[PDB]
């Protein structure tokens, strides 16, 4: 375990859950703010690439947080409506959409989040909504 | 393994060997310049706290550098002559002083280094000496 203190290790990554309500854009900035250019470490909202990473992220979050609510992740379609990508540039092979999602409700939902139910099934929500958030380190 | 690219993982630490002759002070300045305050990651010259870390560092160095020569470590007695301290603030427990060391030769040796001989036994040397160096990450 070579993760920074207050960050959890799993695979080739470190993860850290922030138990504070905020907007997706603010969460994005807060995660990116933990980057370290001298060590080529890129910090970002969590990206999710397998059922096992989903489960990991979900169980880490719900292991700390007992409140009903959502968890921002780095999935978004801001720049191309309908095409959800990761902020960290990683490829989009894994999805876990909740039934009826993504629905771009009121033509204003471009930001992805886990629900606290159904193993962390994903919803698209808006720039005004608030949720907790999870950051991930990528050692480039 | 959660070490940055080009750093080697061992225990709770990451290490990196630089195959470049330089002074201790420059080596120290170089290692520290990799530090990252956003993740509380100290980069510094290597500190050695067991025979196991000693062997790990020695074999890592010698697996790359087959030249006769020395490797700077973060041990120095500039402030208090004869009382060596680690630049990373960790306490000195383990030592592996070569016979007849540390001798403060010519009243002018404040800086610790492995020799390439005898499993990397330590010598103190001066501010004008040149050696290769190794950095270490500490997750503070
Ligand atoms: Ca849109
Ligand atoms: Ca949308
Ligand atoms: Ca929705
Ligand atoms: Ca002295
Ligand atoms: Ca001395
Ligand atoms: Ca000496």
DSSP string for B89-120: SPPP----BPTT-S--GGG---EEEEESSTTT
Could you tell me the distance, in angstroms and rounded to a whole number, from the CA of residue A67 to the centre of ligand 4? 59
Give residues with Cβ within 8 angstroms of B41, minimum separation 6. Answer: A4, A36, A39, B35, B137, B138, B139, B140
The b/e string for A46-68 (b: 16+ C-beta within 10 A; e otherwise) is bbbeeeebbebbbebbbeeeeee
Instruction: List chain A residues with CB under 8 Å of B38.
Output: 33-36, 43
Looking at residue B129, the DSSP 8-state letter turns out to be -
d(CA B49, CA B90): 9
Q: Among B46, B72, B55, which Cα is nearest to B131's?
A: B72
Residues of B in contact with A38 (CB under 8 A): 33-36, 43
> What are the chain B neighbours of A139 within 8 Å (beta carbons)?
2-5
Tokens 């930001």, residue located:
A111
Domains of chain B: 1-140 (3.10.100.10)
CB contact under 8 A, B38 and A34: yes
CB spacing of B9 vs A3 below 8 angstroms: no
Give burial (CB, 10 Å; 0-12/13-18/19+) of B22.
middle
Q: Report the structure determination method.
A: X-ray
Nearest in space to B96 (alpha carbons), one of B69, B115, B82, B74: B115
Quote the CA–CA distance of B71 and A91 in Å, as a whole number: 42
Could you tell me if A71 and A133 are in contact, meaning their C-beta atoms sit under 8 angstroms apart?
yes
Contacts of B139 (CB under 8 A, 6+ apart): A2, A3, A4, A5, B12, B13, B39, B40, B41, B42
- What are the backbone angles phi and psi of residue B11, rounded to the nearest 5°? 70, -135
Going by their DSSP bridges, the two strands B70-76 and B131-139 should be labelled as parallel
| A positions 118-137 inside 8 Å of B (CB) | 137
Which among A38, A30, A27, A55 is positioned nearest to B14, based on CA atoms?
A: A38
Is A33 in CB contact (< 8 Å) with chain B?
A: yes
């Amino acid at each position: 375990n070579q993760c920074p203190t207050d960050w959890e290790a799993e695979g080739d990554h470190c993860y850290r859950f922030f138990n504070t309500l905020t907007t997706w854009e603010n969460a994005h900035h807060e995660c990116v703010s933990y980057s370290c250019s001298t060590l080529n470490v890129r910090s970002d909202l969590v990206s999710v690439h397998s059922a096992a990473e989903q489960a990991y992220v979900f169980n880490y979050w719900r292991g700390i947080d007992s409140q009903a609510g959502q968890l921002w992740i780095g999935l978004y379609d801001k720049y191309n409506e309908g095409d959800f990508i990761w902020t960290d540039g990683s490829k989009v092979g894994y999805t876990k959409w909740a039934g009826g999602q993504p629905d771009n409700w009121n033509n204003a939902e471009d930001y992805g989040q886990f629900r606290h139910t159904e193993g962390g099934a994903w919803n698209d929500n808006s720039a005004a909504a608030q949720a907790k958030y999870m950051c991930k380190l990528t050692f480039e």
